[PDB]
UniProtKB/Swiss-Prot annotation, chains A, B:
TM spans (from-to): 413-433
Location of the region described as E1 fusion peptide loop in the Swiss-Prot/TrEMBL record: 84-101
Organism superkingdom: Viruses
Locations listed in the record: Virion membrane; Host cell membrane
Binding partners and assembly: Interacts with spike glycoprotein E2. The precursor of protein E3/E2 and E1 form a heterodimer shortly after synthesis. Processing of the precursor of protein E3/E2 into E2 and E3 results in a heterodimer of the spike glycoproteins E2 and E1. Spike at virion surface are constituted of three E2-E1 heterodimers. After target cell attachment and endocytosis, E1 change conformation to form homotrimers. Interacts with 6K protein. Interacts (via fusion peptide loop) with host LDLRAD3 (via domain LDL-receptor class A 1); this interaction mediates viral entry to the host cell.
Protein name: Spike glycoprotein E1
Amino acid sequence: YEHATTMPSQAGISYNTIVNRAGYAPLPISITPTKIKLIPTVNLEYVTCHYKTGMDSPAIKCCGSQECTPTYRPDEQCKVFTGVYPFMWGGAYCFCDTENTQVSKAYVMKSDDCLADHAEAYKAHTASVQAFLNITVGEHSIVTTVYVNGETPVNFNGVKITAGPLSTAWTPFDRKIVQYAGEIYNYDFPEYGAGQPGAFGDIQSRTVSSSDLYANTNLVLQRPKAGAIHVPYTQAPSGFEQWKKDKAPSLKFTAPFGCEIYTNPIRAENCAVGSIPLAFDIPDALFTRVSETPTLSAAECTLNECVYSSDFGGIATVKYSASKSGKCAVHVPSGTATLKEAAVELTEQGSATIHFSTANIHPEFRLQICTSYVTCKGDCHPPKDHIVTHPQYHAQTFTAAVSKTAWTWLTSLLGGSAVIIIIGLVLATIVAMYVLTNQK
Amino acid sequence: YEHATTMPSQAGISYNTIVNRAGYAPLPISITPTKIKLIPTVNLEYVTCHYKTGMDSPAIKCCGSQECTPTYRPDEQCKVFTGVYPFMWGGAYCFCDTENTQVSKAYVMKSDDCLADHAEAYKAHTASVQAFLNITVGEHSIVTTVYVNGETPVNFNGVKITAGPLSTAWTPFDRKIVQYAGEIYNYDFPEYGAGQPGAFGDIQSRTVSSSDLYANTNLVLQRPKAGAIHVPYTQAPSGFEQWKKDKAPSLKFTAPFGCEIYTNPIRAENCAVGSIPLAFDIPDALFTRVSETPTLSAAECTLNECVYSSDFGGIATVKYSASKSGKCAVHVPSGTATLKEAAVELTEQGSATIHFSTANIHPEFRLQICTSYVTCKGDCHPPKDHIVTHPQYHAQTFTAAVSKTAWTWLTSLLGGSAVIIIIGLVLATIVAMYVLTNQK
Ligand SMILES: *[C@@H]1O[C@H](CO)[C@@H](O)[C@H](O)[C@H]1NC(C)=O
Ligand SMILES: *[C@@H]1O[C@H](CO)[C@@H](O)[C@H](O)[C@H]1NC(C)=O
């Protein structure tokens, strides 16, 4: 037997349904999502951190001249200044007043703290969805991680369940993300080998331990101060620190649908978007006979009180005269009310208490018990608190909260609109016939 | 300056271009794709090998009874066969004619050779195109790997180059692929936990070293033969061996467009499909004035010998009277002839030989020397050999091979009919005017 349903993607809220074969005991099914994870496929582009302008000692040649060698280091600048007269603590370092040269080199590498303070630039695509589910089919329970691709099955006690695919392809991440300090930022970082000075990714390394290091920090060399041994340089400040000075709140605080953004692996959790289409395959063995389950006779629903709040604010009592005791499944086929429980203990005679949540002013829901269907009615009152801290436990309709008196006005005004028109047409036809009869 | 072009995705065949500025020396471009890789993203969800049906030693009890231990191993089956009379090498085992019990249980494990002789099932999507290019711009050369996403740039001598994205999204790998013995198969394997007996994936392990194993092989325990201590079982023959028996040739032999399917990483190399858009950003320092390059005047192109073969069958010469010697670029802006080279040495006066490949019988191609432009015209003969081992080095048009006699026949059959129609219309108008004039 193949069953199909559609459970909204909302963690922490149960989803109870019932499988009704033509002549067999109903089968209760409950799916409880404890966590829904969306994990994009991310590949590392590069890693950025503060740079260090490590720079070689200035080689001074007296009374002569020097030439520059490349040495092939990231963003290396080498320059020879002629006419220096360097000084030390001991006195004048050189014995020629002029024609002394000083060659100064300045390169850039990753800082000493790049092994801990670095931001990784990822590219994300083709997100994959997983869900932690507590499933209960016909008293057969399981707690398992299901992949929400519409093909991977979770199987237990002969029952197969295939979840998904998620009705939406929306993902909180763009095509380029930046992960720093265990916090995902949605940033459009420069491509590798295309970084710019003063901005994110001015220095780039393919990996934290990688030997290669692109570096474009606008490094230039200035002439040393007269009578001083040092290598002056003026380059644009670190792009990593500048990015951190203003980077906007992370995806923890800006992701739509209230997603929770986590790292290792980069994932989103409890995104309240879309619905998961569930497909059950229940073997015929689990469908027992009607005589084995209690059979209900002479049952009626009484609505003790209803308050159409977000939580289970409504209650009902069913007067029942059952064939025997035992567990009995309860359900609401309509979408006008959702029960807290999908089962109830049932005695030979008595009354059963059922908690439910609804959004209707005047409920009219055709509740199902063991095999019988009892219509349950009543009135609801507004909840006593304006703002709550939990999501909505039901689903509303466009005509849910109209209430009887608004129906009365809308019908009287629209019906009265039609009645007067009908009277006008009747009078017109009558007088037309009368005039035609007046023709001699 | 930004120069955008396109290049056919055909490995080995050099693609030559000339970029012309307003009044500066033309700049040659030469791109040689040595190798083009298409690398899909693959997720491994299980591996499969030959199974080994393990089984415990039978537990024999004389004048007694035993109970089945709960199953805790892959496909474990346990049965307590009663009324056995085991018979060891040292006579009968039990002194008890009947009410002797034998517990026999069996289960499935991976074979001892699953570390090497296994096939791993991947899911493939979102192929990532890569290329290996020789780029030559203005006597500046670089051999590099270019990611054919339309954003990653390659830098050399101040020149930016961005290739891609590939004009087509075609990939030879299906959604589900299988790697075995270095060969890739487009196999629609069952999902993990859905393996069936006697078919590929009857036993499934998430990874090679994983401690989990899903086994479904119809293992069934049979009653032991009288007087024998052994565990008789029955199960479907291994699905891995059956798949190996009839699995069809791998993608290496069936992939369209002549792709070469390689492994580690799973990739398709040298597919003759699609085109790669190229975008060059050339710094303005590379362009030099026409005065520096050797300008040319008073030249004409004579076609020595043309054969429209796949290779460079056409040979022509240009009689040049250059202002000075040096390098000079040559290119055909049209597609009716592709030159062998994009550079030639010019003396003060002389003749320079050019090799070109054409697909048309009468090449009226508008050759472009570095400064002067020469129209080259002639006739061609068909090639001698029906089959060659080279790909086509030129691009053919729909009207390339129409020749002159067919043009005359077409411009006769069409055209003469239009002339006859014009004559008929003229005669009709003339006689209509004549008959209208004769009203009086
Ligand atoms: C399902 O299992 C989870 C984890 O053990 C638990 O938090 C949740 O309350 C369970 N739900 C039901 C209906 O048993
Ligand atoms: C392209 O690179 C390969 C590898 O170095 C080389 O064999 C080949 O000659 C190169 N082609 C050109 C035109 O430079």
